């Protein structure tokens, strides 16, 4: 049963979320890495709006954002996926398909799981509330490396879990599998994070440079 406090919290989260494309290969890469920077900036802005987040130590904020950023970017990307054209649209105007990503020099091993995830997420047909809560739940993962106040992180995570459960019970009143199905996507996101670290590793083999913000959160 969705409480007034939960309703108000979810609505607030939803409300909080409301180089040119043409070496030539590396102009595409610069365009994409620049869009990724925009996503990371938005992730940080949203995190700061999450109840409980700014009360964690700044070090715990950084610990959580360092490793959740790729997962939240993947969630945000899934949300922008167009099943009919099999494309993903960034900043409302920039639409891209698998070939576009390959042309930027990204590996097939990276591209294909992200498209497969995006397609599986699309079948779920999550709305803005469900995406917002799942992003919150991904951010408040107590098992991230270097988290100090694991108890508080876990406590926070559970309040978002409980809100998602109650919300989904109104959105999907005859399908009790929707709630766990959503949660189970967080499992796929963990595997995808390791696919991502493999792409980051390959970029440095190729002497392909991540811009400073991206390098800071992802380079070893």
């Amino acid at each position: 049963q969705l409480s007034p406090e939960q309703l108000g919290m979810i609505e607030k989260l939803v409300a909080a979320q409301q180089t040119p494309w043409p070496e030539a290969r590396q102009q595409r890469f610069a365009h994409f890495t620049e869009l990724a920077i925009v996503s990371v900036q938005e992730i940080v802005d949203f995190a700061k709006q999450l109840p409980g987040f700014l009360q964690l130590s700044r070090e715990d904020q950084i610990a959580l954002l360092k490793t959740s950023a790729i997962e939240v970017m993947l969630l945000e990307t899934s949300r922008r996926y167009n099943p009919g054209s099999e494309s993903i649209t960034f900043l409302k105007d920039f639409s891209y398909n698998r070939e576009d990503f390959a042309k930027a020099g990204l590996q097939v091993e990276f591209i294909n799981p992200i498209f497969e995830f995006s397609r599986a997420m699309n079948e779920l047909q999550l709305n803005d509330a469900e995406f917002a809560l799942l992003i919150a739940i991904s951010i408040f993962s107590a098992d991230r490396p270097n988290v100090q106040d694991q108890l508080q992180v876990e406590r926070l995570q559970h309040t978002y879990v409980e809100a998602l459960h109650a919300y989904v019970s109104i959105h999907h009143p005859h399908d009790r599998l929707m709630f766990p199905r959503m949660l189970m996507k967080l499992v796929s996101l963990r595997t995808l994070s390791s696919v991502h670290s493999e792409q980051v590793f390959a970029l440095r083999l190729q002497d392909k440079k991540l811009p400073p913000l991206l390098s800071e959160i992802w380079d070893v």
Binding site: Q61, I62, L65, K66, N146, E216
Partner: peptide
Amino acid sequence: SLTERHKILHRLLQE
């Protein structure tokens, strides 16, 4: 610390 090694993220958080 993580903080000292993540200047840009730290600045974004401080804003």
